[PDB]
């Protein structure tokens, strides 16, 4: 099938809310070993987010059940619930492993040294999916992926801070997710709030640099950054 029909399936699959087919189409596109366009990058990211996202939601529903029922004291149920949790974990870990491969074997590799915008995005993406693994890992396994998530974000942070305007949506989107990694995984609210507030403050400072093609994209992420800082600062006051 022509490359253009693949992308057209992705668009269609998205509209039909069939993200498994959408992700499969973009995987093929990625494996043709040509660089992805801006729209294509969006399709890839949205496809696998929805796929992996459905598992995260289910896993959280099930892991939640596992804490409420563990008190009842019926071992027949506790076993099967734990078993179902494992089933979903395996699925989630498989999807992540699939994306991470596409990133390391095709996307990040074919990026030259002047494609900062694409490299930051893929690296930001790489950090996101190692983090998904961290949400369901424990012991040394969790330690390994968290280290990998850090390395991905950290590098993306440096490139974006050096080559991208603070108002750039990719740079903003990185600060957002990277700050989440701190608060949720690393449990470092100070590092989270600081990174988010700064990323937001720097965008207001140079707010005149919004380009019309994507001003609406940058403004959206900025709201999310503030919605986070509001939510986070209210959690610290309950714990205290």
């Amino acid at each position: 099938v022509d490359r253009e029909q693949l992308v057209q399936k992705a668009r269609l699959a998205e509209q039909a809310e069939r993200y498994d087919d959408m992700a499969a189409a973009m995987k093929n596109v990625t494996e043709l070993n040509e660089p992805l366009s801006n729209e294509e990058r969006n399709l890839l990211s949205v496809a696998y987010k929805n796929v992996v996202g459905a598992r995260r939601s289910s896993w959280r529903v099930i892991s939640s059940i596992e804490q409420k029922t563990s008190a009842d004291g019926n071992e027949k149920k506790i076993e099967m619930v734990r078993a179902y949790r494992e089933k979903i974990e395996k699925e989630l870990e498989a999807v992540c492993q699939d994306v991470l491969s596409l990133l390391d074997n095709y996307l990040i590799k074919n990026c030259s040294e002047t494609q900062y915008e694409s490299k930051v995005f893929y690296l930001k993406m790489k950090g996101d999916y190692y983090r998904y693994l961290a949400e369901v890992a424990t012991g040394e396994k969790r330690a390994t992926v968290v280290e990998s998530s850090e390395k991905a974000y950290s590098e993306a942070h440096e490139i974006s801070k050096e080559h991208m305007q603070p108002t750039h949506p990719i740079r903003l989107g990185l600060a957002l997710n990277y700050s989440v990694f701190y608060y949720e995984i690393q449990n470092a609210p100070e590092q989270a709030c600081h990174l988010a507030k700064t990323a937001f403050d720097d965008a207001i400072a140079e707010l005149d640099t919004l380009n019309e093609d994507s001003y609406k994209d940058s403004t959206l992420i900025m709201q999310l950054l503030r919605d986070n800082l509001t939510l986070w600062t209210s959690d610290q006051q309950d714990d205290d």
Partner: peptide
């Protein structure tokens, strides 16, 4: 469990 807001969309046009 309590997630914060996130984002995953490259600028189209």
């Amino acid at each position: 469990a309590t997630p914060p807001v996130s984002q995953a969309s490259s600028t189209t046009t």
